[PDB]
């Protein structure tokens, strides 16, 4: 026979298959995966920034400073929050935090955080500091919320106290105050002397006047009255004044915050860890260069897009057709 030259192409040992628009299960010499399916299964630091575990406290109890919670005095920043859905501790004294949904959203993640003293606890005037057996501290002593001070009558008299805060920080400042609603006009008399007390809170943009709503609530922890805690974000250069003659939980500590609402409040019962990823899910951390993922719709950070799909194989080689 003669000299001969042939053109041909690659064949291999593969069960590798891809789907095309026109055909299912086409054998190919090589392919890659587009969807990320592997995660750490743990809570990780997010792009260098550690989260904050709330331990046995709910977010509410954490933010007001429930003495049973670990203090947030030393925190500087968090990428996200870890909260136990069945956390035992919250507002230790029977009460409610007003507009807590918005607050949760705004504290989901904050790049610059630091607690600060708005107004000195003794700078208020002639009043005492009230504690309660509902808010016991680490020891067992009666106490109260770190961020609020329960002012009561001193020497059978409750004077009209009035202080104001000036936002000089150059950043947004979260202020917290509260209103205590006693079980009866009798208790408000015992605690605040004045009948029908009031609290007036104002800025140069809004102004609220609070009166007491006496009655017996089916509370918890032994008390039967009710507390309503409010909050407001004071902007740089703004000022908020508090005036009261009873039933007032005064602001002591506030929070200086910058770049916030950048997080998430995960409630997943998975473990925290030393790892670091660019994408955290409620199921684990994800570190990948792939741009898709089918692990969990609840994800935060520089994440691949979550999609509802099985693995997607992109063909790189050619059709794998066996040797003649």
């Amino acid at each position: 026979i003669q000299d001969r030259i042939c053109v041909g192409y690659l064949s291999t040992n593969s069960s590798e298959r891809v789907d095309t628009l026109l055909e299912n299960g086409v054998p190919v010499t090589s392919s890659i995966d587009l969807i990320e399916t592997n995660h750490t299964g743990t809570y990780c630091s997010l792009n260098g920034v550690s989260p904050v575990h709330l331990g046995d406290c709910s977010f509410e109890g954490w933010i007001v400073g429930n003495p049973a919670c670990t203090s947030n005095f030393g925190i500087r920043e968090w990428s996200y929050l870890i909260e136990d859905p069945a956390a035992p501790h919250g507002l230790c004294y029977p009460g409610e935090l007003n507009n807590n949904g918005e607050l949760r959203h705004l504290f989901s993640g904050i790049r610059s955080f630091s607690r600060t003293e708005l107004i000195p606890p003794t700078s208020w005037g002639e009043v005492l500091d009230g504690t309660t057996s509902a808010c016991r501290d680490n020891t067992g002593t009666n106490s109260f919320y770190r961020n609020l001070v329960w002012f009561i009558k001193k020497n059978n008299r409750y004077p009209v106290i009035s202080k104001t805060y000036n936002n000089t920080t150059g950043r947004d400042v979260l202020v917290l105050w509260g209103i205590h609603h006693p079980v009866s006009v009798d208790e408000t008399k015992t605690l605040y002397v004045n009948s029908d007390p009031y609290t007036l809170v104002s800025t140069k943009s809004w102004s609220e006047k609070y009166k007491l709503e006496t009655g017996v609530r089916p509370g918890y922890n032994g008390q039967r009255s009710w507390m309503k805690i409010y909050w407001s974000l004071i902007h740089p250069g703004e000022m908020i004044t508090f005036e009261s003659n009873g039933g007032f939980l005064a602001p002591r500590y506030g929070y200086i915050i910058e770049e916030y609402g950048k997080g998430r409040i995960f409630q997943s019962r998975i473990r925290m860890s030393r790892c670091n990823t660019k994408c955290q899910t409620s199921v684990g951390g994800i570190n990948t260069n792939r741009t898709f993922q089918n692990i969990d719709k609840n994800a935060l950070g520089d994440c691949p897009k979550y999609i509802k799909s099985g693995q997607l194989k992109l063909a790189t080689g050619l059709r794998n057709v066996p040797a003649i």
Binding site: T12, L314, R319, A323
Partner: protein, 165 residues
């Protein structure tokens, strides 16, 4: 489709090393398999550019669309979830379809590449070879190991052999 792969060249070559396309020769003095670095590398660059584009162009924000809500704001909470879901449904369908469309085009590209390689050899030889219609060419003259190489590297001159045919 270009009728080459799984077409008139009805089978692949196991033991084709470091390449997707190539040649198989047989003269008096042996055999005879080598990859075509030119067309293979060019195809590898294309697949790489394709993959890189598909991935590098996704440079937006793709984490969840969701906020924090208490149990009294269910409606706004349900809309937020429905919107997140809708956005996810758009990306889901596009991802599945893009991959199907792209796999379609990738296989056909390879088919086109080996077909253009076959045509390239056929143009070189002209009347100095018989086209067997299966990827092979039967030379009408004798071909050195140096002759084979000139065919492979595209320099083979049909005039320098015309007569032995």
């Amino acid at each position: 489709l270009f009728g080459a792969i799984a077409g008139f060249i009805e089978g692949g070559w196991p033991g084709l090393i470091n390449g997707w396309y190539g040649f198989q020769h047989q003269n008096e003095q042996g055999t005879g398999i080598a990859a075509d670095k030119e067309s293979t590398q060019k195809a590898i660059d294309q697949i790489t550019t394709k993959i890189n584009n598909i991935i590098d162009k996704m440079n937006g924000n793709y984490d969840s669309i969701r906020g924090e809500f208490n149990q009294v704001e269910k409606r706004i909470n349900m809309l937020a979830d429905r919107i997140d879901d809708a956005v996810t449904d758009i990306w889901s369908y596009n991802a599945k379809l893009l991959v199907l469309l792209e796999n379609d085009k990738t296989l056909d590209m390879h088919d086109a590449n080996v077909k253009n390689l076959h045509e390239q050899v056929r143009r070189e030889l002209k009347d100095n070879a018989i086209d067997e219609g299966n990827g092979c060419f039967e030379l009408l003259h004798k071909c050195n190991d140096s002759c084979m190489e000139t065919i492979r590297n595209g320099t083979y001159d049909h005039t320098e052999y015309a007569e032995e045919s």
